[PDB]
Design a binder for this molecule. Structure first.
Ligand SMILES: Oc1c([C@@H](Nc2ccccn2)c2ccco2)cc(Cl)c2cccnc12
Ligand SMILES: Oc1c([C@@H](Nc2ccccn2)c2ccco2)cc(Cl)c2cccnc12
Lengths: 264, 270
């Protein structure tokens, strides 16, 4: 019952990026895989902690909509190995290559994402950084939620997806299922409008300040016409400035399924 | 945090099928899933064992070409929950609806299956029932090796008698100690490569189950390789023949089979 990969079996290749801790690479281990390593040979103290935290969460997940954790290593360097997703992140599709998804496909992507979130929450896992860039469209179909570590289970910037309470830090622990729900709301906004929120404001600090005070919020009137009213309503629900008024995924999921069933 | 699903969360629907090791369904648990249950009112001691053994093997797997194990339940009834595959099995594509896959695709299905087998064997897991019926073509793109009811971790039964087309001669004779090995899995893989390249099941012109069993076992009968498609790469027809060797110890292991398929793939027509 061990997920530790034997020493020196992982072949590392092209450098991809650098999420959470360390650097991510496309590598080899019983096929293509993603490898999140640590450049230093001296794992330091709190680096060996963020490492054990991620593995600890990742290893509690087995769901088609959650990036597949395959194993970890301490080999020469600490390394988390996950499946290799073929394609691009939803963020890249929507805002870089501006892919034109049909409404059916957009509804389905929101569904799978919620499917995935519902699962994480059932396991008492709070993502804490859900955003269109951590949502991968594997093989152009099938959502894979990724990048954890920053994720916890039970007791740069990504402000666009941060709920008002999170921005305020009036608890130092404003994170909860509800704040995950809010970010999903911002993700819904992207799919449904094809754009990032507040694109007409060029000052981040202003954006941060105003969302936190409840003065600014996503402009829902921007939703595409062919967007089902029930979706636009689900969206507003998730984006409630007041935490406790937001619905939970079991509910989100039911709503998205009923609007999807009656769409064609 | 075990993989034991909390009680009363799994719902079951369509009865996709039956079997000696339980019947399959298309239930739900955080999205669609495949639920394998046990109809009986009280599991016999051997069933409880088959259940445990499968879960023990399944929970050791995390690979894109292995059907995803999600959890099990015992309280309501013994149940194994796996991801629900969208599409059909390679068997159905190949022999029931005759799907016209391109050689590039066939080589690909052959590669992924090998990739999966390579993964199981590295963890000392012997499938023991690899066949096109248990190879799901998820979304018509991803190969998912399933049905782990007879699987076992080396150094850890008397079942099966239905799918003889994929049984190696030494498995039919049951002479040797440990009839099953990484090699018998490789033989089954060989019959699958055979199915992929010919589009047909072996021994289609013989209709007597017993005679086929006896003959393949005695070595009088073997897969007719002259039937392999003409556009089938030579190295492949060779790799196939090697996996089908009558002498167990002459068959290559998946790491080498994997290396070969990947090699003959890089030099394929354009
Ligand atoms: O492609 C991958 C990325 C990249 N995400 C996206 C998202 C949209 C389009 C293109 N890439 C990325 C890397 C670094 C920073 O972002 C990140 C990780 Cl962890 C992967 C893990 C396994 C397979 N593929 C992965
Ligand atoms: O569909 C599934 C089957 C059935 N196989 C096929 C093959 C071709 C077309 C349709 N179904 C089946 C039924 C009975 C005994 O095996 C078996 C498993 Cl393990 C599955 C696991 C996840 C998703 N789907 C699965």
């Amino acid at each position: 019952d061990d997920w530790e990969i034997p020493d020196g079996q992982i072949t590392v290749g092209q450098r991809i990026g650098s999420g959470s801790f360390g650097t991510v690479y496309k590598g080899k281990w019983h096929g293509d895989v993603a490898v999140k390593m640590l450049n230093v040979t001296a794992p330091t103290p709190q680096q060996l902690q963020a490492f054990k935290n991620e593995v600890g969460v990742l290893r509690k997940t087995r769901h088609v909509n959650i990036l597949l954790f395959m194993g970890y290593s301490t080999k020469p360097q600490l390394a988390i190995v996950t499946q290799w997703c073929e394609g691009s992140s939803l963020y890249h599709h929507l805002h870089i290559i501006e892919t034109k998804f049909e409404m059916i496909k957009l509804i389905d992507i929101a569904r799978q994402t919620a499917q995935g979130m519902d699962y994480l929450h059932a396991k008492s896992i709070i993502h804490r950084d859900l955003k269109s860039n951590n949502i991968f469209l594997h093989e152009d179909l099938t959502v894979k939620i990724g990048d954890f570590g920053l994720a916890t289970v039970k007791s740069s910037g990504s402000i666009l997806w941060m709920a008002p309470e999170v921005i305020r830090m009036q608890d130092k622990n404003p994170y909860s299922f509800q704040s995950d729900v809010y970010a999903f709301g911002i993700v819904l906004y992207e799919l449904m409008t094809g754009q990032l929120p507040y694109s007409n404001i060029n000052n981040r600090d202003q954006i941060i300040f105003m969302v936190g005070r409840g003065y600014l919020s996503p402009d829902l009137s921007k939703v595409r016409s062919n967007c089902p009213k029930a979706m636009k309503r689900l969206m507003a629900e998730c984006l409630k400035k007041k935490r406790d008024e937001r619905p939970l995924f079991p509910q989100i999921l039911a709503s998205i399924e009923l609007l999807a069933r009656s769409l064609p």
